Amino acid sequence: LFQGPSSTVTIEYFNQKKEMTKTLEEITRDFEKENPKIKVKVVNVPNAGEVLKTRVLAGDVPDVVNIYPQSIELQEWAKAGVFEDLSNKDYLKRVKNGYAEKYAVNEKVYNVPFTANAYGIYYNKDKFEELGLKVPETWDEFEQLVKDIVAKGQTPFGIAGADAWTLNGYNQLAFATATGGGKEANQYLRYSQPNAIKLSDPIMKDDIKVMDILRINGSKQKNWEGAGYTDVIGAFARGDVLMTPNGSWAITAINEQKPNFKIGTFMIPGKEKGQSLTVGAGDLAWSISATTKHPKEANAFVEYMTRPEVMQKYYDVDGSPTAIEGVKQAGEDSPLAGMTEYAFTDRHLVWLQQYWTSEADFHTLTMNYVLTGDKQGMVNDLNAFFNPMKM
Ligand SMILES: [Cl-]
Ligand code: NA
Numbered sequence: 001l002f003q004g005p006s007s008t009v010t011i012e013y014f015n016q017k018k019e020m021t022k023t024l025e026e027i028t029r030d031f032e033k034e035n036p037k038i039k040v041k042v043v044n045v046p047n048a049g050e051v052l053k054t055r056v057l058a059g060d061v062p063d064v065v066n067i068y069p070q071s072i073e074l075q076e077w078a079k080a081g082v083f084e085d086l087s088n089k090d091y092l093k094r095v096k097n098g099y100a101e102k103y104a105v106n107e108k109v110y111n112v113p114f115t116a117n118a119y120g121i122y123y124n125k126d127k128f129e130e131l132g133l134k135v136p137e138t139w140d141e142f143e144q145l146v147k148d149i150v151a152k153g154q155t156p157f158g159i160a161g162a163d164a165w166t167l168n169g170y171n172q173l174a175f176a177t178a179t180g181g182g183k184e185a186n187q188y189l190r191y192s193q194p195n196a197i198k199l200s201d202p203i204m205k206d207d208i209k210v211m212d213i214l215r216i217n218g219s220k221q222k223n224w225e226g227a228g229y230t231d232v233i234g235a236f237a238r239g240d241v242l243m244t245p246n247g248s249w250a251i252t253a254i255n256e257q258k259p260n261f262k263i264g265t266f267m268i269p270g271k272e273k274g275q276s277l278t279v280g281a282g283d284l285a286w287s288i289s290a291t292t293k294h295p296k297e298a299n300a301f302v303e304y305m306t307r308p309e310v311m312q313k314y315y316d317v318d319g320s321p322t323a324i325e326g327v328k329q330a331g332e333d334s335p336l337a338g339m340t341e342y343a344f345t346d347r348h349l350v351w352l353q354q355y356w357t358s359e360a361d362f363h364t365l366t367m368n369y370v371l372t373g374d375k376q377g378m379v380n381d382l383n384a385f386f387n388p389m390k391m
Contacts, residue, residue: 009297010039014055014062016048017284019252023317030313031304038297040064049073056082061289063298069103069111070281070354078105084288084295086110091303096323096344103282103350112302113282114311115320118248118348119169120268120278120339126261127154127242135266135338137273139177139206142213149242150218158232158241159214161225164367166232167214168359169279170245170268171366172352174210176277177270178203182349190355194387199379206271208378214370225371233257248280248320251335265339267347278339279349283320361385 013028015021021044028040043062045051053073055061061082067074077083086092087109092100100109128134131152136142149156160166175185188203197204214220221227221241230253236244237257244250245268254263267276286305288298304310308326315322315329319336321343322329330337342348353359365381368374 008037008039009294010041011063011292011294011297011301012041012043013064013301014043014048014052014066016066016068017318018044018048020284020314020318023314027305027310027313030310031301034304035297035300038300040301059291061291063289063292063294064301065287065289066285067111067287068282069113069285069287070351072357074103074111074287075105078108078110078287081290083110084290084292084298086112086288086302089299089303091299091306094306094308094325096325099323099344111282111285111287112306113323114284114286114305115282115315115318115322116285116343116348117280117283117320118278118336118339118343119173119246119280120265121243121245122236122250122254122335123243123264123266124236124239124261125264127239128264135264136269137276138269139210139213139271142269143216146213146216146219150216155221155235155241156216156219156243157214157221158227158235158244159220159224159370160227160229160232161367161371162227163229164363165360166229166246167366167370168351168353168363169247170214171207171211171362172279172349173268173277174207175203175352176279176349177210177268177275178206181277181346182279182352186352186355189382189386190352190389192386192390194390195383197379197382197386199376204379208375210268211366211369211378215373229253248336248339251319254335262333263335265336267339267342276342277347277349278342279351280343281351281354284314284318357389 025042028042032039085108100113103111136145146156176182179185179188221235232244233253234257235241237254237259239261267278269276286302292298306324311322311324311327315327321340323344362385365378369378
């Protein structure tokens with residue numbers, strides 16, 4: 001006789017947020033209790049981005065994939081039909097206005113960004129209060145703040161000279177504030193002509209001005225040139241430096257050092273007040289295979305995570321800003337409040353490398369400028385990095 005399949009359906013969730021897997025598996029058991037005929041295999045492998053590439057090109061696409069939506073892989077795979085078009089899903093309406101669309105491919109949405117990262121300046125609220133200092137709201141106020149801290153005999157910044165990536169967000173925000181936004185920054189850098197970035201350009205002068213805040217005499221900790229990420233997390237947590245520029249991801253590391261002060265964040269200012277910006281992209285961010293055997297079950301899993309009371313469970317442990325409507329997010333005293341105040345709005349740019357072929361050399365030219373102060377050299381580096389993209 002004809003044999004039908006099993007009554008229960010199993011799907012795979014290919015996770016990249018290893019650190020949250022436990023809460024994710026918990027939420028997955030909640031889903032399974034609601035839906036006793038669905039079982040979800042939560043997969044965590046090392047080198048998950050490379051494994052995903054191997055699996056996709058082999059035609060073994062997980063049913064639900066955590067894929068970072070700024071990635072070239074998401075773009076290209078989406079163009080190639082690897083992922084279900086989510087544009088018309090009712091559950092997509094639960095993502096904040098306009099945000100999913102920032103990752104559209106041929107104007108279609110292929111990914112649900114549940115959470116995103118952000119970037120800005122961590123600062124020590126206690127020390128700012130003791131010193132009578134205020135969060136800066138313009139480039140010029142930021143310059144003055146750094147000078148004022150130095151004059152008071154303390155160290156403005158922890159800078160990880162050995163880990164250039166730490167300043168990717170800083171310099172992207174220098175260019176974004178200098179140009180008016182993220183498209184405008186990529187207009188200047190990426191979509192301009194070969195060799196069009198010049199030291200004489202007003203935009204370059206402004207970028208250098210913002211970078212030069214990090215070059216004020218006495219602005220950085222001793223032996224910063226060779227310092228790593230953990231070294232500056234520790235220096236900040238200890239109160240040895242008053243600020244450090246980094247992403248939203250850093251708060252977890254800072255807390256595990258047991259700081260004895262109240263942590264705040266602020267957005268890197270623009271020239272004018274009201275012009276500050278942040279940058280980041282989807283983190284917990286899911287796509288569905290276009291070739292899953294179990295599309296209803298895959299979609300039900302994605303829908304479940306869009307519900308406010310489900311997303312709440314993840315948000316309460318993870319803490320990254322969420323684009324899901326109806327979640328109660330942390331208050332104005334929480335450490336990430338300043339950095340994430342304008343999350344998911346016009347002022348929360350997608351990482352510029354969405355539209356770049358690589359990024360490490362941009363990190364390097366940024367940190368090498370902090371190290372050397374060589375302005376022409378930095379301009380030369382920028383053209384060397386962007387010229388190949390402009391073939
Ligand atoms: Cl210094
Ligand atoms: Na909505």
